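Q: I'm a student working through a structural biology exercise. My instructor gave each of us a protein and asked us to get a predicted structure, then write a short paragraph describing it. Mine is APC variant protein. I'm not confident about reading structure output yet, so if you can add a plain explanation after the tokens, that would really help. Here is the sequence I was given:
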Amino acid sequence: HHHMLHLLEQIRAYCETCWEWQEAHEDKNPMPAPVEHQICPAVCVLMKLSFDEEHRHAMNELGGLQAIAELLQVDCEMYGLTNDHYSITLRRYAGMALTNLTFGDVANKATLCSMKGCMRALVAQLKSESEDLQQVIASVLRNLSWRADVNSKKTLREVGSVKALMECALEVKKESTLKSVLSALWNLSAHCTENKADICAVDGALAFLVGTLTYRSQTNTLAIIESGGGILRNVSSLIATNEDHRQILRENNCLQTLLQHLKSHSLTIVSNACGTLWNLSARNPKDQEALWDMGAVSMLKNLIHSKHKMIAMGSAAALRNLMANRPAKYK
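A: Happy to help. First, here is the predicted structure for APC variant protein. I'll explain a few features afterward.
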């Protein structure tokens, strides 16, 4: 607690010096360099402390989230993305602390989302040369987008987080970065219909998401399939209206893959597939005939008694769509 107090003091003093410089632009106004104030090791220690539940509680009493966000924001403003490795490092460690302080923490989420300049700075970091920094920023946005309040939803949308993350996903090379990026998009895709449209608008995004449905994880997990299929289920309401977008799904084998998902041990994967099939099986005879021919009817019929409400509802609704529309071939 005494240590934490000292570290937060150092970070606050530095920020005040930066804000003074920023406000002295209508020479005795030398631009502060964080290296000259040993900022990296201060945030490093705060980052490490932030992994411990007890130390977090202490950091919050001292407004640690605010202070660390203010530091990230001012360094991003000052040096942009033409910044040095010291800066990239400090943004990573600040972002990792922000991630730890925003897990389920209603006040901390609200605070951070209310800091509009900090939000724009976070979104900007998704194009960092450091993909690890992208992963860390995507983790912050993931946390902020989970159960976001109405003001937080609005701010997340307005600062362009959706297009920025969807564009970021297309370029990531590492599975860990992709996991965080898709988790944030899964959350954001539920928020409103503008976010859904923004996803679908990104060139290549739907083909990419269909790709994630058959992802082969190194780490023996289903995280990518769950989040990628989650995004797809959330946007499938709008894909259903757009013949071009339906066609991108078809020619990446989406329908047979979704049927295979109905067999998953993961209730999340099954639920996501039931919801996507509910929407794609609506009012489209070619996709209805395709599903019939793949044995969809008996597969969906298997799931209608689920105690998982979304599986029960989606499977029965998809099944109704197909049963209303038995292809002539069959008759």
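A: Here are two points you could use in your paragraph. The first helix runs from residue 2 to 23. The chain has one domain: 1-331. It's a good idea to check both against the output above yourself.
Q: Great, thank you!
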